mmCIF file of all heavy atoms in Angstrom:
data_model
loop_
_atom_site.group_PDB
_atom_site.id
_atom_site.type_symbol
_atom_site.label_atom_id
_atom_site.label_comp_id
_atom_site.label_asym_id
_atom_site.label_seq_id
_atom_site.Cartn_x
_atom_site.Cartn_y
_atom_site.Cartn_z
ATOM 1 N N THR H 86 -19.035 -35.583 -54.352
ATOM 2 C CA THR H 86 -19.340 -35.606 -52.902
ATOM 3 C C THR H 86 -19.363 -34.274 -52.270
ATOM 4 O O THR H 86 -20.230 -33.901 -51.391
ATOM 5 C CB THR H 86 -18.445 -36.683 -52.106
ATOM 6 O OG1 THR H 86 -18.582 -37.946 -52.721
ATOM 7 C CG2 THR H 86 -18.731 -36.658 -50.645
ATOM 8 N N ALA H 87 -18.429 -33.383 -52.710
ATOM 9 C CA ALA H 87 -18.351 -32.039 -52.257
ATOM 10 C C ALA H 87 -19.582 -31.229 -52.732
ATOM 11 O O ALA H 87 -20.064 -30.423 -51.930
ATOM 12 C CB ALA H 87 -17.087 -31.387 -52.741
ATOM 13 N N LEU H 88 -20.068 -31.433 -53.946
ATOM 14 C CA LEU H 88 -21.246 -30.789 -54.355
ATOM 15 C C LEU H 88 -22.435 -31.251 -53.561
ATOM 16 O O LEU H 88 -23.307 -30.415 -53.163
ATOM 17 C CB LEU H 88 -21.498 -31.082 -55.864
ATOM 18 C CG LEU H 88 -22.486 -30.066 -56.516
ATOM 19 C CD1 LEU H 88 -22.077 -28.617 -56.404
ATOM 20 C CD2 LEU H 88 -22.587 -30.431 -58.018
ATOM 21 N N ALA H 89 -22.543 -32.577 -53.288
ATOM 22 C CA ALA H 89 -23.628 -33.147 -52.546
ATOM 23 C C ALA H 89 -23.687 -32.541 -51.097
ATOM 24 O O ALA H 89 -24.834 -32.380 -50.589
ATOM 25 C CB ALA H 89 -23.554 -34.699 -52.451
ATOM 26 N N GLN H 90 -22.547 -32.333 -50.526
ATOM 27 C CA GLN H 90 -22.509 -31.721 -49.178
ATOM 28 C C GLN H 90 -23.217 -30.349 -49.079
ATOM 29 O O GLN H 90 -24.038 -30.082 -48.202
ATOM 30 C CB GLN H 90 -21.114 -31.622 -48.618
ATOM 31 C CG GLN H 90 -20.988 -31.260 -47.078
ATOM 32 C CD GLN H 90 -19.547 -31.069 -46.664
ATOM 33 O OE1 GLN H 90 -18.615 -31.187 -47.423
ATOM 34 N NE2 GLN H 90 -19.384 -30.687 -45.346
ATOM 35 N N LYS H 91 -22.994 -29.494 -50.146
ATOM 36 C CA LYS H 91 -23.649 -28.247 -50.267
ATOM 37 C C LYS H 91 -25.211 -28.415 -50.513
ATOM 38 O O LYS H 91 -25.963 -27.738 -49.857
ATOM 39 C CB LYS H 91 -23.147 -27.418 -51.479
ATOM 40 C CG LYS H 91 -21.753 -26.828 -51.340
ATOM 41 C CD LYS H 91 -21.590 -25.662 -52.400
ATOM 42 C CE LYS H 91 -21.795 -26.247 -53.793
ATOM 43 N NZ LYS H 91 -20.831 -25.735 -54.848
ATOM 44 N N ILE H 92 -25.464 -29.294 -51.417
ATOM 45 C CA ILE H 92 -26.913 -29.454 -51.920
ATOM 46 C C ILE H 92 -27.746 -30.094 -50.815
ATOM 47 O O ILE H 92 -28.968 -29.779 -50.677
ATOM 48 C CB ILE H 92 -26.900 -30.330 -53.205
ATOM 49 C CG1 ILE H 92 -26.249 -29.620 -54.333
ATOM 50 C CG2 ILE H 92 -28.435 -30.845 -53.546
ATOM 51 C CD1 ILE H 92 -25.948 -30.573 -55.549
ATOM 52 N N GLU H 93 -27.162 -30.972 -50.008
ATOM 53 C CA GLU H 93 -27.900 -31.676 -48.927
ATOM 54 C C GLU H 93 -28.594 -30.688 -47.913
ATOM 55 O O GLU H 93 -29.576 -30.928 -47.359
ATOM 56 C CB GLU H 93 -27.076 -32.612 -48.097
ATOM 57 C CG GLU H 93 -27.808 -33.355 -46.948
ATOM 58 C CD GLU H 93 -27.136 -34.519 -46.402
ATOM 59 O OE1 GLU H 93 -26.208 -35.057 -47.000
ATOM 60 O OE2 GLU H 93 -27.586 -35.036 -45.293
ATOM 61 N N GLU H 94 -27.918 -29.501 -47.783
ATOM 62 C CA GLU H 94 -28.359 -28.451 -46.959
ATOM 63 C C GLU H 94 -29.640 -27.733 -47.415
ATOM 64 O O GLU H 94 -30.241 -27.015 -46.665
ATOM 65 C CB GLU H 94 -27.215 -27.398 -46.623
ATOM 66 C CG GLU H 94 -25.950 -28.039 -46.038
ATOM 67 C CD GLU H 94 -24.694 -27.151 -46.114
ATOM 68 O OE1 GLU H 94 -24.777 -25.954 -46.253
ATOM 69 O OE2 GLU H 94 -23.544 -27.797 -46.045
ATOM 70 N N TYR H 95 -29.989 -27.959 -48.710
ATOM 71 C CA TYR H 95 -31.116 -27.289 -49.266
ATOM 72 C C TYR H 95 -32.466 -27.687 -48.791
ATOM 73 O O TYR H 95 -33.447 -26.928 -48.879
ATOM 74 C CB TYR H 95 -31.133 -27.468 -50.829
ATOM 75 C CG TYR H 95 -29.932 -26.865 -51.557
ATOM 76 C CD1 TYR H 95 -29.658 -27.203 -52.933
ATOM 77 C CD2 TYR H 95 -29.158 -25.850 -51.008
ATOM 78 C CE1 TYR H 95 -28.684 -26.638 -53.577
ATOM 79 C CE2 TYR H 95 -28.118 -25.255 -51.728
ATOM 80 C CZ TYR H 95 -27.892 -25.713 -53.046
ATOM 81 O OH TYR H 95 -26.840 -25.116 -53.738
ATOM 82 N N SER H 96 -32.544 -28.917 -48.336
ATOM 83 C CA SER H 96 -33.912 -29.453 -47.923
ATOM 84 C C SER H 96 -33.737 -30.690 -47.106
ATOM 85 O O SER H 96 -32.790 -31.513 -47.394
ATOM 86 C CB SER H 96 -34.669 -29.827 -49.199
ATOM 87 O OG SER H 96 -35.965 -30.300 -48.840
ATOM 88 N N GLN H 97 -34.664 -30.923 -46.172
ATOM 89 C CA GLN H 97 -34.860 -32.139 -45.457
ATOM 90 C C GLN H 97 -35.083 -33.388 -46.372
ATOM 91 O O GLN H 97 -34.740 -34.502 -46.024
ATOM 92 C CB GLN H 97 -35.989 -32.157 -44.505
ATOM 93 C CG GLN H 97 -35.725 -31.314 -43.232
ATOM 94 C CD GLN H 97 -36.913 -31.291 -42.267
ATOM 95 O OE1 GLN H 97 -37.966 -31.777 -42.524
ATOM 96 N NE2 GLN H 97 -36.572 -30.758 -41.099
ATOM 97 N N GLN H 98 -35.598 -33.030 -47.540
ATOM 98 C CA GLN H 98 -35.953 -34.128 -48.545
ATOM 99 C C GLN H 98 -34.677 -34.718 -49.093
ATOM 100 O O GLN H 98 -34.714 -35.817 -49.660
ATOM 101 C CB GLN H 98 -36.734 -33.450 -49.736
ATOM 102 C CG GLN H 98 -38.100 -32.953 -49.431
ATOM 103 C CD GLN H 98 -38.759 -32.126 -50.514
ATOM 104 O OE1 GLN H 98 -38.818 -32.596 -51.633
ATOM 105 N NE2 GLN H 98 -39.265 -30.969 -50.167
ATOM 106 N N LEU H 99 -33.533 -34.002 -48.840
ATOM 107 C CA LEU H 99 -32.248 -34.481 -49.402
ATOM 108 C C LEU H 99 -31.344 -35.075 -48.257
ATOM 109 O O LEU H 99 -30.212 -35.356 -48.539
ATOM 110 C CB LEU H 99 -31.501 -33.325 -50.096
ATOM 111 C CG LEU H 99 -32.193 -32.800 -51.361
ATOM 112 C CD1 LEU H 99 -31.655 -31.353 -51.727
ATOM 113 C CD2 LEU H 99 -31.973 -33.752 -52.528
ATOM 114 N N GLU H 100 -31.879 -35.321 -47.058
ATOM 115 C CA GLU H 100 -31.161 -36.008 -45.976
ATOM 116 C C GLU H 100 -30.448 -37.242 -46.523
ATOM 117 O O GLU H 100 -31.050 -38.017 -47.342
ATOM 118 C CB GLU H 100 -32.243 -36.442 -44.970
ATOM 119 C CG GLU H 100 -31.951 -37.497 -44.013
ATOM 120 C CD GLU H 100 -32.109 -38.899 -44.597
ATOM 121 O OE1 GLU H 100 -33.213 -39.302 -45.066
ATOM 122 O OE2 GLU H 100 -31.112 -39.627 -44.510
ATOM 123 N N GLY H 101 -29.187 -37.464 -46.171
ATOM 124 C CA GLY H 101 -28.378 -38.654 -46.581
ATOM 125 C C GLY H 101 -27.727 -38.515 -47.938
ATOM 126 O O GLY H 101 -27.062 -39.394 -48.364
ATOM 127 N N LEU H 102 -27.993 -37.439 -48.683
ATOM 128 C CA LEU H 102 -27.426 -37.343 -50.060
ATOM 129 C C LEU H 102 -25.921 -37.523 -50.078
ATOM 130 O O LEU H 102 -25.404 -38.233 -50.982
ATOM 131 C CB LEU H 102 -27.820 -36.028 -50.721
ATOM 132 C CG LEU H 102 -27.399 -35.763 -52.132
ATOM 133 C CD1 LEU H 102 -28.141 -36.733 -53.218
ATOM 134 C CD2 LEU H 102 -27.637 -34.282 -52.567
ATOM 135 N N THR H 103 -25.231 -36.879 -49.229
ATOM 136 C CA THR H 103 -23.737 -36.872 -49.274
ATOM 137 C C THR H 103 -23.247 -38.276 -49.149
ATOM 138 O O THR H 103 -22.344 -38.686 -49.927
ATOM 139 C CB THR H 103 -23.161 -35.957 -48.131
ATOM 140 O OG1 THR H 103 -23.663 -34.601 -48.255
ATOM 141 C CG2 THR H 103 -21.565 -35.837 -48.231
ATOM 142 N N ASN H 104 -23.696 -39.012 -48.114
ATOM 143 C CA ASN H 104 -23.299 -40.411 -47.972
ATOM 144 C C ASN H 104 -23.696 -41.257 -49.220
ATOM 145 O O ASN H 104 -22.955 -42.172 -49.658
ATOM 146 C CB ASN H 104 -23.838 -41.013 -46.706
ATOM 147 C CG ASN H 104 -23.296 -40.319 -45.478
ATOM 148 O OD1 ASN H 104 -22.094 -39.850 -45.454
ATOM 149 N ND2 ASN H 104 -24.060 -40.364 -44.394
ATOM 150 N N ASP H 105 -24.919 -40.969 -49.740
ATOM 151 C CA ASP H 105 -25.408 -41.752 -50.878
ATOM 152 C C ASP H 105 -24.398 -41.605 -52.103
ATOM 153 O O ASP H 105 -24.143 -42.526 -52.913
ATOM 154 C CB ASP H 105 -26.774 -41.287 -51.347
ATOM 155 C CG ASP H 105 -27.827 -41.587 -50.341
ATOM 156 O OD1 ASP H 105 -27.640 -42.488 -49.531
ATOM 157 O OD2 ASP H 105 -28.883 -40.993 -50.452
ATOM 158 N N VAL H 106 -23.841 -40.365 -52.232
ATOM 159 C CA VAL H 106 -22.967 -40.028 -53.353
ATOM 160 C C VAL H 106 -21.516 -40.570 -53.160
ATOM 161 O O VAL H 106 -20.864 -41.025 -54.032
ATOM 162 C CB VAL H 106 -23.014 -38.497 -53.657
ATOM 163 C CG1 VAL H 106 -21.817 -38.033 -54.598
ATOM 164 C CG2 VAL H 106 -24.325 -38.080 -54.180
ATOM 165 N N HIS H 107 -21.170 -40.580 -51.888
ATOM 166 C CA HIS H 107 -19.867 -41.054 -51.442
ATOM 167 C C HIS H 107 -19.729 -42.617 -51.719
ATOM 168 O O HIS H 107 -18.619 -43.173 -51.845
ATOM 169 C CB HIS H 107 -19.580 -40.721 -49.980
ATOM 170 C CG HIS H 107 -18.221 -41.294 -49.531
ATOM 171 N ND1 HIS H 107 -17.093 -40.709 -49.988
ATOM 172 C CD2 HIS H 107 -17.964 -42.363 -48.827
ATOM 173 C CE1 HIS H 107 -16.111 -41.456 -49.480
ATOM 174 N NE2 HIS H 107 -16.596 -42.439 -48.749
ATOM 175 N N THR H 108 -20.866 -43.322 -51.846
ATOM 176 C CA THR H 108 -20.838 -44.755 -52.107
ATOM 177 C C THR H 108 -19.946 -45.059 -53.348
ATOM 178 O O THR H 108 -19.147 -46.094 -53.445
ATOM 179 C CB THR H 108 -22.188 -45.417 -52.434
ATOM 180 O OG1 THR H 108 -22.780 -44.699 -53.535
ATOM 181 C CG2 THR H 108 -23.144 -45.259 -51.220
ATOM 182 N N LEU H 109 -19.912 -44.109 -54.419
ATOM 183 C CA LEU H 109 -19.228 -44.452 -55.628
ATOM 184 C C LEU H 109 -17.688 -44.576 -55.365
ATOM 185 O O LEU H 109 -17.101 -45.598 -55.665
ATOM 186 C CB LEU H 109 -19.476 -43.449 -56.705
ATOM 187 C CG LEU H 109 -20.908 -43.261 -57.112
ATOM 188 C CD1 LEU H 109 -20.992 -42.343 -58.290
ATOM 189 C CD2 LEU H 109 -21.640 -44.567 -57.409
#
Side-chain angles (χ1 to χ4, degrees):
Chain H
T86 298
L88 198 54
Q90 188 184 0
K91 287 196 305 218
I92 294 161
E93 178 163 349
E94 301 164 22
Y95 294 164
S96 182
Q97 286 185 352
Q98 290 171 54
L99 294 161
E100 158 280 303
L102 183 66
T103 304
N104 298 328
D105 294 340
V106 169
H107 179 72
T108 59
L109 304 187

